[PDB]
């Protein structure tokens, strides 16, 4: 609460690199002057890097393993892209065009751009906007959880998901009051912006599957296919 807040913080901090574990060996500060196979493979590799991490993070959210197994899977699948983006935006340093991935790998915008396409600029724009809110770690630990624990079509126990959402929203509300209510509304406003960004992700994967230089890994492909409402 209390403990909830602390459990949520501990789960967030254990899901990402220590500042000490950052890896700059591939980082190129000046990128020399048409997407190829290596760019597409890296795109899928970067996305796949978060899969196990977000799963283990979710499992540490109190209540989440008390949802039905099918609702756990559906929540994770539906939120994956949004969670990948939000955590990336928050971890990264958009004033330097530095992307920081959950493995600790650091890359410059231009080293990713051909894989991600335009979407990476949209993600950096959202990241600079996220950074201007100066969201502290506890608030972010709640927000990220709220991205995951939210209503989706096909949940078996939507009310229990709603109750867990309420608990976390309450936790966040109280925390924001303690530290400092339009801040709260500003924070919460990032959730719909994130969805709209997730859409450009689905557009980029669609384009890549069309192009078919390298196919998406099975797990990313499944998320894509299951998250299509047609």
Swiss-Prot record:
PTM entry text: Acetylated by p300/CBP, acetylation increases stability. Deacetylated by HDAC1.
Region ranges (AF-2): 216-227
Annotated compartments: Nucleus; Cytoplasm, Cytosol; Mitochondrion
Region annotation Binds lipopolysaccharide: where it falls in the sequence: 158-180
UniProt tissue specificity: Fetal muscle and adult liver, brain and thyroid.
Regulation: induction: Induced by cytosporone B (Csn-B); directly stimulates its own expression. Induced by corticotropin-releasing hormone (CRH). Induced by growth-stimulating agents.
Domain NR LBD: 1-227
Quaternary structure and interacting proteins, as annotated: Binds the NGFI-B response element (NBRE) as a monomer. Binds the Nur response element (NurRE), consisting of two inverse NBRE-related octanucleotide repeats separated by 6 base-pairs, as a dimer. Interacts (via N-terminus) with NLRP3 (via LRR repeat domain); the interaction is direct, requires binding of NR4A1/Nur77 to NBRE-containing dsDNA and lipopolysaccharide, and leads to non-canonical NLRP3 inflammasome activation. Interacts with GADD45GIP1. Interacts with STK11. Interacts with IFI27.
Family: Belongs to the nuclear hormone receptor family. NR4 subfamily.
UniProt free text on domains: The NR LBD domain binds the lipid A moiety of lipopolysaccharide (LPS) in the cytosol.
Function of the molecule: Orphan nuclear receptor. Binds the NGFI-B response element (NBRE) 5'-AAAGGTCA-3'. Binds 9-cis-retinoic acid outside of its ligand-binding (NR LBD) domain. Participates in energy homeostasis by sequestrating the kinase STK11 in the nucleus, thereby attenuating cytoplasmic AMPK activation. Regulates the inflammatory response in macrophages by regulating metabolic adaptations during inflammation, including repressing the transcription of genes involved in the citric acid cycle (TCA). Inhibits NF-kappa-B signaling by binding to low-affinity NF-kappa-B binding sites, such as at the IL2 promoter. In the cytosol, upon its detection of both bacterial lipopolysaccharide (LPS) and NBRE-containing mitochondrial DNA released by GSDMD pores during pyroptosis, it promotes non-canonical NLRP3 inflammasome activation by stimulating association of NLRP3 and NEK7.
Name of the protein this chain belongs to: Nuclear receptor subfamily 4immunitygroup A member 1
Native source species: Homo sapiens (Human)
Lineage of the species this protein comes from: Eukaryota, Metazoa, Chordata, Craniata, Vertebrata
Gene name of the encoded protein: NR4A1
Section covered of the full-length record: 361 to 598 of 598
